[PDB]
Amino acid sequence: SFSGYLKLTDNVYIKNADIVEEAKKVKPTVVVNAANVYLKHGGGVAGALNKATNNAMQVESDDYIATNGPLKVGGSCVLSGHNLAKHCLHVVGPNVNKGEDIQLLKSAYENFNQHEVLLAPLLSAGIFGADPIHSLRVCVDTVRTNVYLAVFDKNLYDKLVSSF
Numbered sequence: 407s408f409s410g411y412l413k414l415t416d417n418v419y420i421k422n423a424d425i426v427e428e429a430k431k432v433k434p435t436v437v438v439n440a441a442n443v444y445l446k447h448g449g450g451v452a453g454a455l456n457k458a459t460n461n462a463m464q465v466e467s468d469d470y471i472a473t474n475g476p477l478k479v480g481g482s483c484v485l486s487g488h489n490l491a492k493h494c495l496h497v498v499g500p501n502v503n504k505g506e507d508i509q510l511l512k513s514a515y516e517n518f519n520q521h522e523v524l525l526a527p528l529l530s531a532g533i534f535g536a537d538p539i540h541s542l543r544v545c546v547d548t549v550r551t552n553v554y555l556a557v558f559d560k561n562l563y564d565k566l567v568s569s570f
């Protein structure tokens with residue numbers, strides 16, 4: 407099971423870890439991907455998860471978009487977790503670097519409530535441009551199911567814990 411996580415609330419836990427390595431070790435029921443609306447997994451968490459699947463995540467994602475069209479910002483879809491998890495919940499948080507509305511971050515975290523337990527990154531953080539301290543606050547105030555947050559950067563992890 408999940409190990410070495412610091413407890414933040416009744417249901418939110420956090421660890422300084424690479425979500426790829428965490429997923430390979432735990433093989434959770436659900437791993438969250440920090441997706442974009444086109445499911446083009448180029449960089450950040452999405453690029454790293456896709457690379458770990460040997461591009462199988464991108465092949466499945468392209469078939470999903472060809473059938474269904476793009477997701478909405480704040481929306482999600484459930485696909486295979488391949489070699490990382492039973493399922494991957496692809497969630498689209500707003501990308502501040504593309505000018506998207508930061509109020510959609512709460513809608514993005516609401517997708518997590520459809521799953522009892524998840525391994526996840528902070529949405530809209532990293533290359534999506536939002537303040538990770540804000541993202542953690544919205545996560546704690548929105549998600550009611552059990553969420554295990556993996557924060558790649560050690561210095562950001564320490565700041566997130568110390569300012570919580």
Ligand SMILES: O=C(Nc1ccc(C(=O)NCc2c(C(=O)O)[nH]c3ccccc23)cc1)NC1CC1
Nearest residue numbers: 426440450451454527528530531532533557558
């Ligand atoms: O390449 C990797 N891992 C690996 C590579 C990159 C990341 C990463 O961009 N993280 C930042 C991030 C966070 C976060 O950390 O809060 N949230 C986000 C939301 C959207 C986009 C990005 C982020 C994460 C993991 N592993 C290989 C070597 C075995």
